[PDB]
Amino acid sequence: GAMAPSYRVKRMDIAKNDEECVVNAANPRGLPGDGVCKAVYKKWPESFKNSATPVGTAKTVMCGTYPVIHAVGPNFSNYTESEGDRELAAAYREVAKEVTRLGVNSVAIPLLSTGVYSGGKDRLTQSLNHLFTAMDSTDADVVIYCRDKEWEKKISEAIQMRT
């Protein structure tokens, strides 16, 4: 793992990450989708061979030797707040298992269920806290990707708060 495991946040295209593997905010059917999922499809299209997986799970497919971890957050349009929250926590726990199995020293990760799966709500804090619960016990350097200038500030603050 990383010598001093850390969290960082960058405001850029996750398709341009400088990490040893990437987490896709995937749909359950392995379709190209939109947002992060569309950029991942354009950069690593080979990774979508048999990528379909249920909500609350993660499935890794290699693009050459570069791992793409397809993590399926819930669509809060379809789920109750209670069941959506349980599936969102589960998806990040499956990501932590896959990152550990792969033996990577770093991972690029988006906030799951915060874009077109958010059901039109701000889920920054909900999704980030589930990311921390899952990844805190791993020793990989985690680099969180966002697009919004205000989200970059709010994620940076939440990382710095814990030290």
24 is in an annotated binding site: no
Alpha-carbon torsion angle 127, 133, 135, 141, nearest 10:
80
Q: Residue 36 binds what, of ligand FBB, Cl ion, none (CB under 5 to 8 Å, by partner type)?
A: ligand FBB
Spatial contact of 24 and 47, defined as CB atoms under 8 Å apart: yes
Residue 115 within binding range of Cl ion, rule CB under 5 A: yes
Residues that bind ligand FBB (CB under 6 A): 13-15, 35-36, 39, 110, 145-147
- Say if residue 64 carries a ligand binding annotation: no
Q: Contact 25/73 with Cβ under 8 angstroms?
A: yes
Is 117 marked as binding a ligand?
yes
Amino acid at 109: I
* Residue 32: CB minimum distance to ligand FBB, A: 13
Between 96 and 146, CB nearer to ligand FBB: 146
Q: Looking at beta carbons only, is 1 or 63 nearer to ligand FBB?
A: 63
The one-letter code for the residue type at 149 is K
The minimum distance between CB 49 and Cl ion, in angstroms, equals 22
Q: Residue 146 binds what, of Cl ion, ligand FBB, none (CB under 5 to 8 Å, by partner type)? A: ligand FBB
Instruction: Give the dihedral sign, CA 113/63/144/150.
Output: negative
- Is 116 a known ligand-binding residue? yes
Q: What angle do CA 62, 65, 71 make, to 5 degrees?
A: 35
